[PDB]
Enzyme design. Structure first.
Site, PDB file in Angstrom:
ATOM      1  N   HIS A  40     -59.738   0.071 -36.746  1.00  0.00           N
ATOM      2  CA  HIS A  40     -58.374   0.514 -36.448  1.00  0.00           C
ATOM      3  C   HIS A  40     -57.988   0.276 -34.991  1.00  0.00           C
ATOM      4  O   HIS A  40     -56.839   0.495 -34.600  1.00  0.00           O
ATOM      5  CB  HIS A  40     -58.143   1.984 -36.861  1.00  0.00           C
ATOM      6  CG  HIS A  40     -58.884   2.997 -36.041  1.00  0.00           C
ATOM      7  ND1 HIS A  40     -60.107   3.510 -36.416  1.00  0.00           N
ATOM      8  CD2 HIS A  40     -58.534   3.653 -34.910  1.00  0.00           C
ATOM      9  CE1 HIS A  40     -60.473   4.445 -35.559  1.00  0.00           C
ATOM     10  NE2 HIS A  40     -59.535   4.552 -34.634  1.00  0.00           N
ATOM     11  N   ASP A  84     -64.631   0.958 -41.312  1.00  0.00           N
ATOM     12  CA  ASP A  84     -63.912   0.984 -40.044  1.00  0.00           C
ATOM     13  C   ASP A  84     -64.796   0.441 -38.920  1.00  0.00           C
ATOM     14  O   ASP A  84     -65.352   1.197 -38.128  1.00  0.00           O
ATOM     15  CB  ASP A  84     -63.464   2.421 -39.743  1.00  0.00           C
ATOM     16  CG  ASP A  84     -62.486   2.501 -38.587  1.00  0.00           C
ATOM     17  OD1 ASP A  84     -61.965   1.449 -38.171  1.00  0.00           O
ATOM     18  OD2 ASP A  84     -62.232   3.623 -38.099  1.00  0.00           O
ATOM     19  N   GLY A 175     -58.739   8.609 -28.095  1.00  0.00           N
ATOM     20  CA  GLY A 175     -59.097   7.891 -26.891  1.00  0.00           C
ATOM     21  C   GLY A 175     -60.568   7.511 -26.947  1.00  0.00           C
ATOM     22  O   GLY A 175     -61.032   6.675 -26.172  1.00  0.00           O
ATOM     23  N   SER A 177     -62.078   6.603 -30.036  1.00  0.00           N
ATOM     24  CA  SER A 177     -62.273   5.662 -31.140  1.00  0.00           C
ATOM     25  C   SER A 177     -62.956   4.363 -30.734  1.00  0.00           C
ATOM     26  O   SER A 177     -62.677   3.808 -29.667  1.00  0.00           O
ATOM     27  CB  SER A 177     -60.936   5.320 -31.810  1.00  0.00           C
ATOM     28  OG  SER A 177     -60.666   6.194 -32.893  1.00  0.00           O
ATOM     29  N   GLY A 178     -63.836   3.881 -31.607  1.00  0.00           N
ATOM     30  CA  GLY A 178     -64.550   2.640 -31.350  1.00  0.00           C
ATOM     31  C   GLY A 178     -65.796   2.849 -30.513  1.00  0.00           C
ATOM     32  O   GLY A 178     -66.679   1.986 -30.469  1.00  0.00           O
TER      33      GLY A 178
END
Lengths: 223, 58
Positions: A40, A84, A175, A177-178
């Site tokens: 995402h 994801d 903030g 994410s990933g």
């Protein structure tokens, strides 16, 4: 990161920031020219920022390298959030070790209870809004698939796992994410989603990396 | 204006931090908010212009 603490200077060398004018996602360096992040987090014209605990400094110890390729998992579902994960190739190779080192991929999946390290420059408030200047860290245990599914009925796939505390107070947030979830020196998770941040009975949900090792290796070898 | 314009901004479950615009019906102005990356609702725009063109009219 809510309820966390300022990471030790350069204690998280594999942590990177995905930039599109400003920091919007985290990522993990898996080698000199490849970064692993959440699907995402895909955007065109992404630039990767590495080797700098402070997210605002320019011309410090950081390195800005443009993404030359951003490959989202072919079965990423933006509704269920299944699969994801995304791979980003850097336009040029980054200088490794000192403040920029890669994180090893897992050889096997971790187990519930295993303590892991989660990091990012995300929100530090569960209700308010306060984004940090420096990288934040958090120690959180992997939760049983059983309690994960009970927390999010019908939302957890075999490619996800929960980590954190059901009591709330400690969790990743917008903030982050990933970003990486490292357990025993291995990248087992990727910050993905959750109902709010640090809320009771609402732990963080992470992409289960051990399920994509083959996809990662083959993708890197073919591109 | 469409009814979805009256809904409060929805950050969503995902955890990235990207700025988007939403029509703040109480202020009658399009303002920015933090979108989490997934499951966006209709009162979520990529520019103030699009937000105003869609939700500005009475």
């Amino acid at each position: 990161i809510v309820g966390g603490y300022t990471c030790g200077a350069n204690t998280v060398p594999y942590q990177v920031s995905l930039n599109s004018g400003y920091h919007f996602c985290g990522g993990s360096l898996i080698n000199s020219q490849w970064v692993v992040s959440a699907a995402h987090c895909y955007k065109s014209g992404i630039q990767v920022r590495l080797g700098e605990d402070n997210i605002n400094v320019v011309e410090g110890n950081e390195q800005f390298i443009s993404a030359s390729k951003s490959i989202v998992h072919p079965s990423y579902n933006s509704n269920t959030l299944n699969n994801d994960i995304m791979l980003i190739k850097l336009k040029s190779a980054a200088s490794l070790n000192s403040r920029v080192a890669s994180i090893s991929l897992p050889t096997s999946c971790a187990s519930a209870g295993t303590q892991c390290l989660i990091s990012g420059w995300g929100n530090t408030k569960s209700s308010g809004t306060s984004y940090p200047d420096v990288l934040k860290c958090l120690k959180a245990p992997i939760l049983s698939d059983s309690s994960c599914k009970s927390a999010y009925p019908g939302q957890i796939t075999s490619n996800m796992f929960c980590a954190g505390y059901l009591e709330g107070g400690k969790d990743s947030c917008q903030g982050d994410s990933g970003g990486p979830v490292v357990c025993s020196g291995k990248l087992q998770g990727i910050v993905s989603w959750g109902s709010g941040c640090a809320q009771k009975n609402k732990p963080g949900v992470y992409t289960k990396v051990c399920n994509y090792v083959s996809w990662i290796k083959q993708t890197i070898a073919s591109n | 204006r469409p009814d979805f314009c009256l809904e409060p901004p929805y950050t969503g479950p995902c955890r990235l931090r990207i700025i988007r615009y939403f029509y703040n019906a109480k202020a009658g102005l399009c303002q920015t908010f933090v979108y989490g990356g997934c499951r966006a609702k209709r009162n979520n725009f990529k520019s103030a212009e699009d937000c105003l063109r869609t939700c500005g009219g009475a």
